[PDB]
Amino acid sequence: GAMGSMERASLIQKAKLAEQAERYEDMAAFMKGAVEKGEELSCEERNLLSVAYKNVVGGQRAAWRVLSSIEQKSNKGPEVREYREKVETELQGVCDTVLGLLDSHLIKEAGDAESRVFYLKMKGDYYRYLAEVATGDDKKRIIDSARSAYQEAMDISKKEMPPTNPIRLGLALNFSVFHYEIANSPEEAISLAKTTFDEAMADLHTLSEDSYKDSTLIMQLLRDNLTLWT
């Protein structure tokens, strides 16, 4: 692509600079370039990829929700619908780009549990974002694609990672949000969050101070959702 002439190391360095500059579109383009070099990503590089695209799609989703709300209230000419559609298409394009990176070829080359779970979680999340805007057709298949990705990630994480692992915790958080917000399965959402929280609590004693801080931070987010849901 357009980053084909830049060194991998330079792309990663520029992604870090773009993060500091709050230039997330640039950050995402740099990390896409890095992925397209064809090498596996390190832990830190996976995090950069994730931060970049979460910020890009986050802005798009926030805009979509503002516009969708205006459109619903109005139900005046075609403009709100047209502009909501424009933002929607752009969002779908970003999701498709991320999903394309995961399929070509990040997931298939990810053999370690940490990397494979991370990428399958991402796959679940980006199908989830597609589901948020999907209507009528393919919507069921999109939801099932999210579910299938999260489920594979869960199965690996349960076998290969401690219950306090931040990736495992974040996966559970997001899969529980999927159940609550997308799958109309609030009880599954609550069960998953509660079991995840309790199993993590019981393993905190094994952790260093730094690991403890990370795990308990995510546990508090699980608890926050349980509070909102009950």
Binding site: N47, D125, G170, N174, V177, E181, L228
Partner: peptide, 8 residues
């Protein structure tokens, strides 16, 4: 919407 995982 329920909050999902924030950035690290």
């Amino acid at each position: 919407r329920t909050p999902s995982l924030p950035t690290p």
